[PDB]
Amino acid sequence: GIREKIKLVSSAGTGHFYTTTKNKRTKPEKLELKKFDPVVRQHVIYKEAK
Amino acid sequence: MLVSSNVTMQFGSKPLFENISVKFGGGNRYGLIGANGSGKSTFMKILGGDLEPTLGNVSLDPNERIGKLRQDQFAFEEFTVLDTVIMGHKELWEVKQERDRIYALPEMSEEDGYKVADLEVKYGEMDGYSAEARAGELLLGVGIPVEQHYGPMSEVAPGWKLRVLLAQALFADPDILLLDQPTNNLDIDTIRWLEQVLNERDSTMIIISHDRHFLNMVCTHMADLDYGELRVYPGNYDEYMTAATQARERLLADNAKKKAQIAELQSFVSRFSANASKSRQATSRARQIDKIKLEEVKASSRQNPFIRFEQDKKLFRNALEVEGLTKGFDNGPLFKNLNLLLEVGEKLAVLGTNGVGKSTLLKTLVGDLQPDSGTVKWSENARIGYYAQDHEYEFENDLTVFEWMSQWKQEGDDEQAVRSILGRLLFSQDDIKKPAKVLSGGEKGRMLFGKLMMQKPNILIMDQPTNHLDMESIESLNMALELYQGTLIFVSHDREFVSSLATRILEITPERVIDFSGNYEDYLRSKGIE
Amino acid sequence: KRMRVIREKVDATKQYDINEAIALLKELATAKFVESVDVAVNLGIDARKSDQNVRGATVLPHGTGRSVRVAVFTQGANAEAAKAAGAELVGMEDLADQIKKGEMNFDVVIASPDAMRVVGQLGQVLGPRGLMPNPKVGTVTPNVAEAVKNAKAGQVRYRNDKNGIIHTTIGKVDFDADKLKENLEALLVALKKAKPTQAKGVYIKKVSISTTMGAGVAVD
RNA sequence: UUGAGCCUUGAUGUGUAGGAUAGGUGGGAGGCUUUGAAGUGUGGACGCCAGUCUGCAUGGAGCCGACCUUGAAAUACCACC
Ligand SMILES: Nc1ncnc2c1ncn2[C@@H]1O[C@H](COP(=O)(O)OP(=O)(O)OP(=O)(O)O)[C@@H](O)[C@H]1O
Numbered sequence: 001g002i003r004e005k006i007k008l009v010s011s012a013g014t015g016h017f018y019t020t021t022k023n024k025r026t027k028p029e030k031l032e033l034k035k036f037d038p039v040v041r042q043h044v045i046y047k048e049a050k
Numbered sequence: 051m052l053v054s055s056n057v058t059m060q061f062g063s064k065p066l067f068e069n070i071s072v073k074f075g076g077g078n079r080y081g082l083i084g085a086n087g088s089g090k091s092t093f094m095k096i097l098g099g100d101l102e103p104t105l106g107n108v109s110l111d112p113n114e115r116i117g118k119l120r121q122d123q124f125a126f127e128e129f130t131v132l133d134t135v136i137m138g139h140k141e142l143w144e145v146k147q148e149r150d151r152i153y154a155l156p157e158m159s160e161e162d163g164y165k166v167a168d169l170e171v172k173y174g175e176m177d178g179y180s181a182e183a184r185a186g187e188l189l190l191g192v193g194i195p196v197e198q199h200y201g202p203m204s205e206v207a208p209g210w211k212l213r214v215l216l217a218q219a220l221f222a223d224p225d226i227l228l229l230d231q232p233t234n235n236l237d238i239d240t241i242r243w244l245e246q247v248l249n250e251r252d253s254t255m256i257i258i259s260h261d262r263h264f265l266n267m268v269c270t271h272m273a274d275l276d277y278g279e280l281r282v283y284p285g286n287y288d289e290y291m292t293a294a295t296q297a298r299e300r301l302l303a304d305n306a307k308k309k310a311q312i313a314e315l316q317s318f319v320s321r322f323s324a325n326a327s328k329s330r331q332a333t334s335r336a337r338q339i340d341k342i343k344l345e346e347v348k349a350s351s352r353q354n355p356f357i358r359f360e361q362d363k364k365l366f367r368n369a370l371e372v373e374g375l376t377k378g379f380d381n382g383p384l385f386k387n388l389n390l391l392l393e394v395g396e397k398l399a400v401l402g403t404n405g406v407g408k409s410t411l412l413k414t415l416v417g418d419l420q421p422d423s424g425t426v427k428w429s430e431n432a433r434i435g436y437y438a439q440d441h442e443y444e445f446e447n448d449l450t451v452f453e454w455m456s457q458w459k460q461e462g463d464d465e466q467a468v469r470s471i472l473g474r475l476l477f478s479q480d481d482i483k484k485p486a487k488v489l490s491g492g493e494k495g496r497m498l499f500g501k502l503m504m505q506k507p508n509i510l511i512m513d514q515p516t517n518h519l520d521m522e523s524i525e526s527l528n529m530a531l532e533l534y535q536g537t538l539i540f541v542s543h544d545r546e547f548v549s550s551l552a553t554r555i556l557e558i559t560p561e562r563v564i565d566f567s568g569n570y571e572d573y574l575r576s577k578g579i580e
Numbered sequence: 581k582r583m584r585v586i587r588e589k590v591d592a593t594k595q596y597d598i599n600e601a602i603a604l605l606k607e608l609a610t611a612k613f614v615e616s617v618d619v620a621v622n623l624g625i626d627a628r629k630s631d632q633n634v635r636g637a638t639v640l641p642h643g644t645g646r647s648v649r650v651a652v653f654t655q656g657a658n659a660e661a662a663k664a665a666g667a668e669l670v671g672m673e674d675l676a677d678q679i680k681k682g683e684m685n686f687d688v689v690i691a692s693p694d695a696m697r698v699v700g701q702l703g704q705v706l707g708p709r710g711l712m713p714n715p716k717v718g719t720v721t722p723n724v725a726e727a728v729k730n731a732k733a734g735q736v737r738y739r740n741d742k743n744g745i746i747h748t749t750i751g752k753v754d755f756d757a758d759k760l761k762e763n764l765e766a767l768l769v770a771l772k773k774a775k776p777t778q779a780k781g782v783y784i785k786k787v788s789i790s791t792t793m794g795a796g797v798a799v800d
Numbered sequence: 801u802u803g804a805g806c807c808u809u810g811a812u813g814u815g816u817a818g819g820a821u822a823g824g825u826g827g828g829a830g831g832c833u834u835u836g837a838a839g840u841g842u843g844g845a846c847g848c849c850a851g852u853c854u855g856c857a858u859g860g861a862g863c864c865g866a867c868c869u870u871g872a873a874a875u876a877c878c879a880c881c
Pocket residue numbers: 061062066085086087088089090091092093230231258481484488489490491492493518
């Protein structure tokens with residue numbers, strides 16, 4: 001509805017992304033969560049893009 | 051062709067503009083008009099490449115260069131004028147940064163012999179020899195002294211130092227030019243020069259402005275930033291006006307026709323569709339209303355601020371009396387022994403034309419002490435409202451917008467009043483949570499009116515009250531300030547405002563001070579200039 | 581005048597032969613002079629990009645027919661080796677700054693990677709005429725003695741105009757035809773080798789050979 | 801009648817500071833003008849209006865580079881644009 005989809009692209013250099021939904025009215029800035037990257041097998045930072 | 055794809059910038063809660071995808075360039079000049087709070091400057095610094103957009107991308111050929119006019123004055127105060135006007139061509143300036151840095155340490159070893167020896171060929175092929183004297187007779191075209199433009203950037207008086215930044219924009223022979231608010235708070239003759247020079251070179255300038263004249267002189271296409279989209283109308287300012295008006299009016303007429311033939315159809319559907327033996331005669335129309343489907347209409351971003359100034363406690367007889375007026379800083383006394391008296395209800399139009407004390411007299415009157423004038427005096431119950439041309443200092447603070455407005459809620463005004471005084475100014479609770487120092491020039495100016503409302507002052511002072519403001523927020527002032535019963539002293543640099551608002555005229559000539567009663571029309575007839 | 585009567589003597593649209601064109605040049609040369617003849621080739625490139633520029637230097641097989649008083653800007657061992665190289669300059673900090681302060685210029689600039697006096701002493705004059713040494717042009721080289729041959733043997737330099745046309749002297753009108761032929765051919769071949777990578781289209785769009793005062797014609 | 805493009809030909813592209821409306825190269829530095837001049841007899845076009853371009857010639861056989869202040873040099877002249 002109002003909460004639409006974004007993807008958290010990996011900042012470990014590879015092509016990997018988790019998918020989540022974010023309320024774009026209240027939060028206008030990106031998401032920054034440390035999430036597991038299985039290609040490199042370590043916890044890197046995961047910025048959002050689309 | 052510099053191209054942009056699906057930018058969709060979101061600032062706080064609502065996108066100023068979404069999924070814009072458009073090509074630019076080709077050697078044309080594009081205006082960038084829009085409503086005062088429409089994020090056009092944000093789009094401009096997205097296009098240049100300063101800040102990354104929320105979505106999408108902007109691609110320009112790496113060799114082709116951009117030249118953007120930045121407002122960061124005295125960001126170059128450390129070094130001199132003739133190189134700060136050159137450093138706007140970044141590719142040839144790092145050349146000097148390396149040439150004058152490698153040399154110093156002794157000596158030119160066998161890595162110097164090939165890192166700096168063929169560094170000067172960069173100088174040659176970027177035309178570094180003809181750098182100052184090609185920028186010299188550009189700073190002179192602007193008017194930054196004539197031969198004195200040198201020494202520390204603090205040497206040039208901060209009154210008009212930003213003309214160096216303006217001349218920095220087009221020195222580099224740039225293909226892309228992105229001058230942003232080029233001639234705000236500026237004079238007329240140098241504007242004439244800029245209008246004539248901009249279209250001499252063959253570039254692809256994107257120009258953002260609000261005056262009709264500049265856009266018509268130096269434009270070939272126009273872009274809007276209305277309804278969250280930029281659609282390019284070829285032509286001029288008047289051409290855009292007529293095109294936009296005609297298209298919106300035809301849309302609001304197509305809407306009327308669709309509404310009429312939908313309402314008539316729905317009448318039949320409501321009459322039928324429940325009849326026991328004629329029910330199936332509404333279903334050839336129930337499916338036809340499903341095929342008219344009037345197109346989405348989006349609220350126009352123009353709007354009108356309901357500005358209304360109201361006095362608190364009115365006064366009588368003399369508003370002020372000033373005698374002794376004499377003050378000068380470097381050149382000498384700008385005005386010597388100026389005597390004037392203002393009855394209540396008077397309106398003054400004290401215009402100066404770029405550096406005659408046109409603002410420092412107002413600063414003295416509101417209070418900026420140590421003049422030779424010992425007989426400046428206000429009325430007794432006087433309450434003063436001040437609009438200085440520098441809105442930066444009042445917003446050098448991390449206060450949110452609403453709480454910043456809440457510095458002066460008078461005894462009787464609540465959250466409801468302090469927030470309705472900005473809701474009246476079409477500011478949204480959407481934007482009520484943002485820090486103060488992030489608003490545009492026109493938005494800051496209108497917030498200053500939202501502060502002038504609170505104090506309910508019987509004296510108003512305005513120093514170029516209209517700057518970076520669009521047409522509508524100047525029309526609201528023209529139709530609201532004229533219905534103000536208290537004293538008014540202002541200086542509008544433009545012409546129509548003073549000709550339609552003035553009651554008395556008082557200008558500081560570079561050697562003396564004039565005075566005249568009667569509006570700017572009668573003053574123009576007295577002068578002899580039409 | 582002469583140029584209202586030879587305008588009909590020379591045709592512009594017609595492309596002449598290599599030998600016939602130089603014969604026409606020799607038959608059009610009238611004014612008393614050595615009349616160093618030149619050639620301008622329209623290289624097909626865009627000057628708006630630095631990567632496509634053609635800055636070069638090559639030695640002609642016959643020579644230009646004139647000598648240049650190249651100044652050796654060196655010091656130390658480098659400035660001492662050039663003394664016996666048959667040059668016309670001395671490399672030192674004083675002889676560069678003060679000596680060249682009033683002096684106009686030399687034909688070429690000696691390579692001075694050993695000293696530290698011939699770096700920026702040129703200033704407005706040493707760079708406005710393009711007299712600074714460069715690595716691509718070979719002016720700034722470590723072998724001063726070897727570069728003496730290029731300085732004295734006719735190390736012709738060439739740089740693009742802001743459009744993309746390279747013109748340089750190919751000899752004098754006193755030179756013979758079978759010598760001017762190979763002289764032009766050597767420079768043309770050097771340009772072909774020096775051609776950059778991303779030079780789209782055909783690079784040699786015209787070869788206009790001419791004299792100082794005569795006419796200018798195409799050859800191919 | 802006129803648009804679009806190309807070859808050719810010819811004009812125009814000054815502040816300062818300098819003789820003076822110097823486009824970049826760079827060939828050269830002594831060449832242009834008397835199968836009829838610098839200046840004079842005289843129109844129009846352009847123009848930041850100070851000045852350039854232009855029928856011929858009674859008279860005509862003499863003007864421009866070196867110096868110079870400039871980032872750079874000069875219709876001394878041609879070239880490719
Ligand atoms: N940090 C921020 N957070 C939220 N919104 C912001 C921020 N900075 C700017 N904005 C918004 O972005 C828009 C900026 O508009 P813009 O600067 O283009 O205005 P303008 O007056 O037309 O331009 P200008 O006066 O700069 O020429 C406004 O809606 C403003 O509220």
